[PDB]
Structures are given as C-alpha cells and as structure tokens.
Design a protein around this ligand. Structure first.
Ligand code: NDP
Ligand code: QLR
Length: 192
C-alpha cells in the first residue's frame, strides 16, 4: 500500500484536549466506544478491511484476550520492532508508512493511539483526517488528567456534519450525547 490517506481517531476532553491519566482513559463512554468500533470496522466496498495502527503501550493496554481488535488489520509500532507479519491480523513495524507497504486489500487506515503516536503523526502529511470526539464536562479541571493532545488545530478545518455523515456512511450520529456528567459530539477535521 503506497502513500495511503490516514485518519486520526481520538476522544478528547475540551478545551485542553486531555486524553488519558496514568496510562488509562479517564471516562468510559459506551456509545463512544461503539462509535469507535463501527467507524474503524466499516468499509464502503466488498472484500476489504480497515487497518488500525497503535503504539506498543496502547496495544498492551488491551486485555490480551480482546486483542487483536476483531475485523481489522492491527498494526503495532515499537522502536524495537523489525518489520514482522505475525499473522493475518497482526503486524509489527517501526513506522506507519513502512508497515503499510506490507499491506494490500485494506481500505481505510486509522491511528487509534496513544498520545505519543498522536502527537508525532498529526504532523505527518499522510494524515488527511481527524475524527475527534469532543468531550465536555462542567468542571473539566476536576478530571484527573496528565496526557494531552498537542494538535495545531489552526492548520485544520472542522467540517460540517454532512461531511462526517458522508465519511461514516449510515452510522447514526447523535448530537450532544450524554453519559454521567460528560456531553460529547463526533467531529471531522481536514487540513486547512
Ligand atoms: N482518549 C482516547 O481516544 C485514547 C487515549 N489513549 C491514551 O493514551 C495514553 C497512552 O499513550 P502513550 O503512553 O503515549 O502510548 P502510545 O500508545 O502512544 O505508545 C508509545 C510507544 O509507541 C512506540 N513509538 C512511539 N513513536 C514511535 C515511532 N516514531 N516509531 C516506532 N515506534 C514508536 C514506542 O514504543 P517502544 O517503547 O516499544 O519503542 C513508544 O514507547 C493512555 O493514557 C491512554 O488512555 C489511547 C488511545 C485512545
Ligand atoms: C486500543 C484502542 C483504544 C481506543 C480508543 C478510542 C476510542 C474508545 N474512541 C475514539 N474516538 N478513539 C479511540 N482511539 C482502546 C482501549 C481499550 O482498553 C482496553 C479498549 O477496550 C475498552 C478499546 O475498545 C475497543 C479501545
């Protein structure tokens, strides 16, 4: 797969874009999790699948029985990994571009975490899309948080809902989704 277009997909607490605390997520948003599954899994054509790409620590964060994420090609990046195809669903590599050179019959490519990977790849020109779930809370400063996105969103353009709807096909997009004290919305951004 040569020069694929790649999407970052992430859920972040506004305005500081917090995404984790001590290696774990600071919320469990059931509908958001289902959205993550649907969008990363769904393809627009028959006989293909998507690839999900993540750093080694994000991989290890998944309970070993629940990885690889089903119905998607899983790609894990480590600075200690030489290129290796583990099985049909798992690839080891040290860069996204080189990992994807090993691949065919893949439609969309998503970056699914974590912070370090996100903060590097936002400045990689293969990334064309940001699927950001904007989370809001009455007192965001009260949420334990030590991990943040460093995204230069001034070089990006938040698209209208119709563009996101087009991207996700028939996936249902509910506005102002509320779980506990969190409210959230799915967004789509493209390079300015
Ligand atoms: N809110 C959300 O939607 C999400 C949040 N998260 C959050 O992110 C946090 C974890 O992120 P973080 O700790 O940064 O972990 P990451 O998953 O980003 O992994 C970092 C590791 O990835 C590998 N890596 C980084 N850069 C490269 C590179 N250029 N080439 C090859 N390998 C590379 C390295 O592995 P190695 O050391 O083996 O070389 C590095 O140690 C958690 O708190 C989690 O909750 C994660 C996913 C989603
Ligand atoms: C390994 C990817 C990470 C994520 C994410 C993620 C989510 C939820 N939402 C959005 N908008 N972007 C993301 N990138 C993730 C960790 C987990 O902990 C074991 C999961 O099981 C509970 C999980 O369910 C599949 C997913």
């Amino acid at each position: 797969m040569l020069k694929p277009n790649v999407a970052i997909i992430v859920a972040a607490l506004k305005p500081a874009l917090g995404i984790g605390y001590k290696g774990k997520m600071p919320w469990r948003l059931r509908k958001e999790i289902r959205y993550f599954k649907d969008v990363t899994t769904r393809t627009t054509k028959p006989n293909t699948r998507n690839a999900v790409i993540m750093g080694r620590k994000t991989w290890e964060s998944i309970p070993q029985k629940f990885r690889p994420l089903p119905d998607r090609l899983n790609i894990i990046l480590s600075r200690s990994y030489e290129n290796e195809i583990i099985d049909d669903n798992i690839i080891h590599a040290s860069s996204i571009e080189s990992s994807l050179n090993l691949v065919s019959d893949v439609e969309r490519v998503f970056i699914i975490g974590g912070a370090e990977i996100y903060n590097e790849l936002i400045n990689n020109s293969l990334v064309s899309h940001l699927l950001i779930t904007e989370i809001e809370h009455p007192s965001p400063e009260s949420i334990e948080m030590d991990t943040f996105l460093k995204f230069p969103l001034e070089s990006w353009t938040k698209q209208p809902k119709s563009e996101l709807q087009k991207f996700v096909g028939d996936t249902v997009l509910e506005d102002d989704i509320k779980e506990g004290d969190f409210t959230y919305n799915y967004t789509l951004w493209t390079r300015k």
